[PDB]
Amino acid sequence: DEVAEKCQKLFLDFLEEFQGEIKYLQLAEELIRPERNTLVVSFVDLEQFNQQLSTTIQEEFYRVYPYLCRALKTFVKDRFYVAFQDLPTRHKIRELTSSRIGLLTRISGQVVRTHPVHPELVSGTFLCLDCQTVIRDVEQQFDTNKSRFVDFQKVRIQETQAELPRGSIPRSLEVILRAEAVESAQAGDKCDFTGTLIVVPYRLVFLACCVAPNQMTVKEWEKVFEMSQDKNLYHNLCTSLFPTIHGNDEVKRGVLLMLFGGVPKTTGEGTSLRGDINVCIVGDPSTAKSQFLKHVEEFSPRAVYTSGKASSAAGLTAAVVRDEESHEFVIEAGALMLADNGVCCIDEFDKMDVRDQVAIHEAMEQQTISITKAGVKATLNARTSILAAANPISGHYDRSKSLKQNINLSAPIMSRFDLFFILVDECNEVTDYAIARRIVDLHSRIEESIDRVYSLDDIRRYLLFARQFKPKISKESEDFIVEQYKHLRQRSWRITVRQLESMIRLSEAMARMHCCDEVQPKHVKEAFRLLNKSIIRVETPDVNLRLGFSEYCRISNLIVLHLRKVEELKRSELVNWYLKEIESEIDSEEELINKKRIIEKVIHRLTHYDHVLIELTEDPYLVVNPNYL
Amino acid sequence: ELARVLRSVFVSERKPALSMEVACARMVGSCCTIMSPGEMEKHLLLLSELLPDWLSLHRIRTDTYVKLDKAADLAHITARLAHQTRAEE
Amino acid sequence: PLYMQRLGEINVIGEPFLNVNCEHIKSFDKNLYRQLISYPQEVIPTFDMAVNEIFFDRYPDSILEHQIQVRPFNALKTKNMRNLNPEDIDQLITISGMVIRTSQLIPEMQEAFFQCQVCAHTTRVEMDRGRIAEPSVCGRCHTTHSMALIHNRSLFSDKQMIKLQTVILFAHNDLVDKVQPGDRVNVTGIYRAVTHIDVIHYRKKLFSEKRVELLKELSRKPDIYERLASALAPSIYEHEDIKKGILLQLFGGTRKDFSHTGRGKFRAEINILLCGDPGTSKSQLLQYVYNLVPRGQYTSGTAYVMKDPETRQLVLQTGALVLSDNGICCIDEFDKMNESTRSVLHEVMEQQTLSIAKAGIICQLNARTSVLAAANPIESQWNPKKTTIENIQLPHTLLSRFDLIFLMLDPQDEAYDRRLAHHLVALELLDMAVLKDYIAYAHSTIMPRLSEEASQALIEAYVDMRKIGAYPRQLESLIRLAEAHAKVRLSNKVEAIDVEEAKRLHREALKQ
Ligand SMILES: Nc1ncnc2c1ncn2[C@@H]1O[C@H](COP(=O)(O)OP(=O)(O)OP(O)(O)=S)[C@@H](O)[C@H]1O
Ligand SMILES: [Mg+2]
Ligand SMILES: [Zn+2]
């Protein structure tokens, strides 16, 4: 093949002239090392150096690969295998056809099974038994001392879930790895393999060479920076992530926090502390129990969804199945281990049998799953965050019975959820009007009725950037957490050390959200409410111009705290202080006059209705009722 | 940068012209940034309007097809794009 | 001549494939059409040669991937699959059918690449008639029996075996993978016996102008709806509201994709529950619906795993629910069903999808079906009580999922018995035959959309309804019913009349 010799000469040219330092000289010198026998070559450098050679290699890789090896051997000997990387095109397993045989392509899949390393005889020195003639350098079409052997690994891969079309069985592919590619892949991992599709007697097999698992653009980086400095980032994210869901913002905050997640810690005793969050939603029907699952599934690419009763014990964690060809027993993966480092959503968790939940138990806390079945002994990682949806007994929360009698769940399962929300439905005219108008507006005005503060892709990029930081806990946060847990535990869903760890995780999640390298007590105060609230209405009613109950409590708390601090004032002075403190939010004269109106009304209402403030004789003195805590 | 990828796409497909849908899908599946197909379509339209000599669009029936000259030097085209960006600034 | 424009379009696109309608050949030349039917395998090369010569004469500078191939389709022999005879061997045949299973990609050699074992002299042999013409001598050193075959260097064509509902189809090259199981295809190809059919072409409007005019004339009648109510189930007496609900379910709602919103695909298909004593019109009505509606399913009170004997791989079989996709599924004796199946039913009722995670098999399936269920009260008699559960014992979830619930009570009124007996002893045609095509036309052509007046009406209806107790799902059902009534009037906009009629029907059902 003249073109093969031309390709060999051009590869020599690339190796000898690519640069102000030649990148491959050190790699070639290290190729002398016995443990190093494959050379990694970038495809982008090959294509930029010349295009004819790049196209020829991409098109006749099998034709010129031994010539490439010969060129590598010649170049090294002047002072072995060739590996390629960074191919710009990704392809799907369902795209692999006979028309692509011999083409250099890279394929994405998930490793499901592995086989041990075997010696493969490449060139064999054969001894004739009739005339004692030694035949050397005999290639094999698919004396041990003088023959050449290469390490081999066989991998079985399965289609990714995202690329799987609905109603289709994910096909499996066989992959051959040699030399340095051996043992570089582990079962349960997702990898991209660069190589070719060869013809085995027929049969389809992929020969691979490589495996796969600051520099961002200026404008994307600047957008991330700008949105990282937003003071209202938390509420804006909460609104944008669920634009079509009305109320129930506590659930939104909880799911956002579990998306952020905490940091895992491993003790010197080797024990691993879970750095994830598990969330349970239980409620009467017609609520948004499901919609959150769908939103988090569509938003996060690493999300898995499943139903309650249709899932068996084997299908959740793993199963032990006998392999047809090998006549042995192997492990088929379950949903939990496929959802590794992701989120798993379970719908109708109540309908699941106890025999299934007891299997879930181990993955819930120890974050790993152990199998000791039929002579098969193994442990697998199950680093997942579980989001469970359920309804109370008989579908309706009966107030004639106790709270404990309204949930048919085991005590450890109740204990192992960090956040446990219970939703109760009530008949209120204003809530009915809001729900009806939202639903009809969505049905009639599909796209123009959506106002998203930030793009979904922007949220994804920000979350990816934020998840890699690991904040430190401050001493002030430390003693604040100590005293808060003191107060909380001094009062069914018992509060154990697990809740303390959940509180620490929530504080760390708040710290990661704000891109802060250290944890501040404000995060602790924020998470304390979320841990406390438990049973939650759809929406609080208005208080007489109207103002929400939460804001009313916030203003009351602020004013009481300031007066009580000053105890160790005057009406006008206190109003001036409040307006000084809230200057960071007001941006217009109208908002200032509105705030003045609101604070005057609230102070009057507290003075004359709630009796928390007592007047003492145009600027009367104000004192706190000594029985408010 | 996207233009570079586009070139490689036409290198990979062994075809002189491709539809909007397949080309946009492959570019999104190979781009370094997650983007919507509509953004890719608008970017392709911008490339066609700025640089018609390299890249041509043909309206056939109910679709628009994309054809490119593979022999053009990428460095000169990149310099022209940088000059156009500077001019628009 | 349309064919010259077709050739120009092929030139512009570069795809060397010609689709030729057999009726055009029959009209142009009956003898040539007969020759095509009798010996397609010999006239197809002639057609390819003629079209290639014409195209190269017109545009000789064509860089074609492959030579232009002619694909005839829609032959007169639209024989039924069961009408095959030994007479039409090696003739073209066209069959309509359903695809069940498709095999994986099967490579077949078409060019054998041989290399000399001494001087590496290379040659190519065309694969002909299932035999390999292996060279015996070398072209350079003339050494006998020095040829080696390289599988990788050889040329392969993709072929696929497909099961059609049964017959075996063999798709080659381009035709491979173009058809997904679960679809209806008209396959045109040559009949061969070893029996099998080799595919040449796949096929995946129906009303004249007079039919559309007649439909418009009928729709302009304000009574047609009620008249259509009289058209449904003539043997069933004094169930006009039930017939109205069945017709509205037949029309159904309109499908909307909320992909830009981040929300799941909302259900747009209507389900109705019926409860009453056995021996009533339940079974007859269910049979009538199943017979009238295409793709209907009848079941009595899902997907499964089958071992492939060939590759020892676990494949999936689709239950009646999946098989009735875009159709209507009717179930009898709802109460008497196992609780596991009813637990499964919640997902298909709500999300129209179904997820399975069993024995390492994880899959999701589309289940766009309408459920028409018949149930029997637990007492076998209407005990005077308050809630429907007190008579039927059904969970609140399943009841809340149903859009419409109707109860069949045999009244203790003598005149009703008179009318029933007279209807029995005495026990239209222009309507149902037209109505099938009318429903198909309404489904394919029109889609209504919501208005502001109907928005305000629905908001008021919701706020009034909750005072009686109310879930947003009944509001969604009311929207669906309004869409169905708008489709009934063939109106592109939902108005006050649709909302008022839907509210009237809902309140009548609740009162009863
Ligand atoms: N706050 C809300 N905003 C918008 N739509 C809502 C709201 N609450 C309820 N809905 C609507 O009511 C539907 C019910 O939500 P789902 O979560 O699917 O039902 P569910 O409460 O989970 O009951 P199950 O578990 O499916 S029996 C939603 O899909 C929305 O269409
Ligand atoms: Mg739900
Ligand atoms: Zn020879």
Residue numbers in the entry:
A (entry chain 6): 20 to 38, 42 to 101, 110 to 172, 194 to 252, 294 to 305, 327 to 604, 613 to 665, 713 to 736, ...
B (entry chain 8): 456 to 544
C (entry chain 4): 191 to 355, 369 to 397, 414 to 423, 439 to 535, 544 to 669, 680 to 721, 729 to 771
Show sentences the authors wrote.
Eukaryotic DNA replication begins with the loading of the MCM replicative DNA helicase as a head-to-head double hexamer at origins of DNA replication. Our current understanding of how the double hexamer is assembled by the origin recognition complex (ORC), CDC6 and CDT1 comes mostly from budding yeast. Here we characterize human double hexamer (hDH) loading using biochemical reconstitution and cryo-electron microscopy with purified proteins. Although both yeast and humans use the ORC, CDC6 and CDT1 to load an MCM double hexamer around double stranded DNA, our work shows that there are clear differences in how the two organisms accomplish this feat.
To characterize the structure that is stabilized by ATPγS in reconstituted human MCM recruitment onto nucleosome-capped ARS1 DNA, we analysed the reaction by cryo-EM. As in yOCCM, the ATPase domain of MCM is oriented towards the C-terminal face of a hexameric ORC1–5–CDC6 ring. The C-terminal winged-helix (WH) domains of MCM3, MCM6 and MCM7 contact the ORC5–ORC4, ORC1–CDC6 and CDC6–ORC2 interfaces, respectively. Conversely, similar to yOCCM, the human ORC–CDC6 and MCM rings are aligned so that duplex DNA can traverse the entire length of the complex. Although the cryo-EM density is of sufficient quality to only build 39 bp, we note that OCCM central channel is 185 Å long, which is enough to protect the approximately 50 bp measured with benzonase footprinting. Inside the channel, ORC2, ORC4 and CDC6 contact both DNA strands, and MCM4, MCM6 and MCM2 track along the leading strand via PS1 pore loops arranged in a staircase configuration. ORC6 is absent in the hOCCM structure, which is not surprising given that omitting ORC6 has no effect on OCCM formation in ATPγS according to DNA footprinting, and 2D averages obtained in these conditions appear indistinguishable from reactions in which ORC6 is included. Two tandem WH domains of CDT1 interdigitate between the MCM6–MCM2 and MCM4–MCM6 α-helical bundle (A) domains. The two WH domains of CDT1 are bridged by an α-helical element that packs against the WH domain of MCM6, connecting the N- and C-terminal tiers of the MCM ring along its outer surface. The MCM2–MCM5 ATPase gate is cracked, yet topologically closed, with a recognizable α-helix from MCM5 packed against the MCM2 ATPase domain, keeping the subunit interface sealed.
